[PDB]
């Protein structure tokens, strides 16, 4: 049709092409005009002229005030950080240095700087530069702790809530507990005078911290508290975050019934208020995929993660920690999905894209990198046992050994010796040593994984069932302790049947191992019994399988807020 271009966009093109000399007058333009000039500079590919203007807190504060166009600002900022210029570190250092010069000034400029720091730290937390947003929030905290007043207590507790989020995402859990204690101190000071701050976001962040620290029970308690402290006047972001973290704490506490409603309502809120192309909606989809993967809904869990990656990769450019987390989650879900197919080409592609990104942006001694190694190794080792070569298989086993060893050392250094994820690493090493034809160490690895996951978690949990299944597969096939293998198979089958019912997909390998065990030990009547049991299992597997997409189950909700929260809370007794 060849529609003539808008005079706004035509002048924007003319001004940008003149940017060599009109670079000082553009900084004095209205905020909506000024951002469009910089977006046109990005679209023309002139990132060096764009990056020399976003490295300044004053200029970046005027483009941060365009709240509707922040979905474009995130992509521009990611392009700048991929360009090579460290805009995130430069802006954080500029704000941290500039706040100290006015921390002794009047309260009005202090509040203006606190607002600018909230905007900038929120942007850098959304983008994923948690280490570069911790500086901004820390500086806001020193701005918030010089005058004794009600609103400064409010700003300080908000600073500690947001600073708890940038320390969970940076895997700084030994500072997060201190930050939460300081936040509780300021909140108790605020409630001392009779003004009660709202603790939904704080308790949600603490729940996310404790879940990340693999303290599932205390995370469940704190998410219960956060749901108890949800009101009607909360922002949608806080409600969505609390619902997501409560669902994640519930699904790892094997309460799939409450977690389903919580995360479905969270997805409905995120899609309704924000939209289908928002970073927060992408995070909510990522947590929804986590729930689906942990409730044996793998086929649509892969599709949900692919929806989460397609949003984060469209908003946050190419090389981001958020895109990296989406890649490492989609790689593991694809790995789980094709575990009975062997087609680990897309899963390995996503797992290697989640390490080539993090190694660029994060140090090698970072905890969040270690998980991305795990997802690769469980893929690579599998590619070893499906390939038709021997040297390739040995090389893949060596590489996966390096990955699991590095991840285990990182987990031991950060978390400690005895928690859930260190035992997950031990179980991974047990599986690897079973594949590496070294079963004497595999027995020890599985035994210590069982010990850690049984003295900390329950004796009837999903992870304990998974590890007893792994250990009994180690025994009945190679180590040949048939009594222990039989009892662990029965334990795993009982736990899986209790948790996910008969339709659990993880019972197939246990049934196959038990059939092989009985063929190797006798009792052919029991062999036929478990064979028809496996036939019934496959019948139930093919039945009720043609289910709709999980993004369709989250329709326009017939349950609103203060109904999902109330249903979750009143069911705790």
């Amino acid at each position: 049709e060849w529609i003539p271009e808008t005079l706004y966009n035509t002048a924007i093109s003319a001004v940008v092409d003149n940017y060599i000399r009109s670079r000082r007058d553009i900084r004095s333009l209205p905020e909506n005009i000024q951002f469009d000039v910089y977006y046109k500079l990005y679209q023309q590919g002139r990132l060096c002229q764009l990056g020399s203007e976003f490295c300044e807190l004053e200029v970046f504060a005027k483009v941060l005030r365009a709240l509707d166009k922040r979905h474009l600002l995130h992509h521009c900022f990611q392009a700048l950080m991929d360009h090579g210029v460290k805009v995130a570190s430069v802006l954080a250092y500029s704000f941290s240095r500039r706040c100290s010069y006015i921390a002794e000034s009047d309260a009005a400029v202090k509040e203006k700087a606190i607002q600018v720091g909230f905007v900038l730290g929120g942007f850098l937390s959304d983008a994923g530069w948690y280490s570069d947003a911790e500086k901004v929030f820390l500086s806001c905290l020193q701005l918030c702790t010089l005058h004794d007043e009600m609103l400064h207590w409010f700003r300080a507790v908000e600073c500690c809530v947001r600073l708890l989020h940038v320390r969970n995402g940076n895997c700084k859990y030994h500072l997060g507990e201190e930050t939460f204690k300081l936040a509780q101190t300021y909140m108790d000071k605020l409630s001392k005078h009779g003004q009660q701050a709202n603790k939904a976001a704080l308790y949600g962040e603490l729940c996310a911290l404790l879940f990340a620290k693999s303290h599932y029970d205390e995370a469940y308690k704190w998410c219960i508290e956060a749901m108890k402290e949800i009101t009607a006047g909360l922002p949608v972001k806080v409600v969505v975050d609390v619902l997501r973290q409560a669902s994640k704490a519930c699904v790892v506490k094997r309460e799939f019934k409450k977690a389903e409603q919580l995360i479905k309502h969270a997805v409905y809120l995120a899609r309704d208020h924000f939209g289908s192309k928002h970073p927060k909606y992408s995070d909510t989809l990522l947590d929804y995929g986590f729930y689906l993967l942990n409730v044996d809904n793998i086929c649509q869990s892969v599709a949900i993660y692919q929806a989460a990656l397609d949003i984060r990769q469209s908003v946050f450019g190419g090389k981001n920690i958020h895109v990296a987390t989406a890649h490492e989650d989609l790689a593991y879900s694809s790995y789980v999905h094709q575990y009975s197919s062997g087609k680990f080409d897309n899963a390995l592609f996503h797992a290697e894209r989640a390490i080539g990104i993090i190694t660029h942006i994060l140090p090698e001694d970072h905890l969040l990198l270690a998980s991305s190694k795990r997802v690769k190794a469980l893929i690579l080792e599998e590619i070893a046992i499906d390939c038709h070569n021997k040297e390739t298989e040995q090389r893949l086993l060596q590489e996966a050994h390096d990955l699991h060893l590095s991840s285990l050392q990182l987990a031991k250094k950060a978390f400690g010796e005895f928690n859930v994820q260190t035992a997950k690493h031990y179980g991974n090493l047990g599986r690897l040593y079973q594949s590496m034809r070294k079963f004497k160490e595999a027995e020890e690895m599985h035994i210590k994984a069982i010990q850690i996951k049984e003295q900390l978690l329950g004796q009837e949990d999903y992870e304990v069932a998974l590890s007893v299944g792994h250990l009994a597969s180690l025994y009945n096939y190679d180590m040949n302790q048939y009594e222990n293998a039989e009892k662990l198979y029965l334990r795993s089958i009982a736990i899986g049947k209790k948790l996910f019912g008969e339709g659990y997909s993880g019972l197939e390998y246990d049934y196959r191992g038990l059939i092989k065990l009985y063929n190797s030990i006798g009792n052919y009547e029991k062999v036929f019994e478990y064979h028809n049991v496996l036939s019934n299992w496959n019948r139930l597997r093919d039945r009720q399988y043609s289910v709709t997409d999980a993004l369709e189950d989250v329709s326009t909700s017939p349950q609103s807020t203060e109904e999902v929260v109330q249903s979750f809370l009143i069911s705790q007794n």
Binding site: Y339, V375, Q421, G427, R431, Q434, L466, H470, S473
Partner: peptide, 9 residues
């Protein structure tokens, strides 16, 4: 196959 899936991401 020989055994079950991989524990967590």
């Amino acid at each position: 196959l020989t055994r079950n899936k991989g524990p967590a991401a």
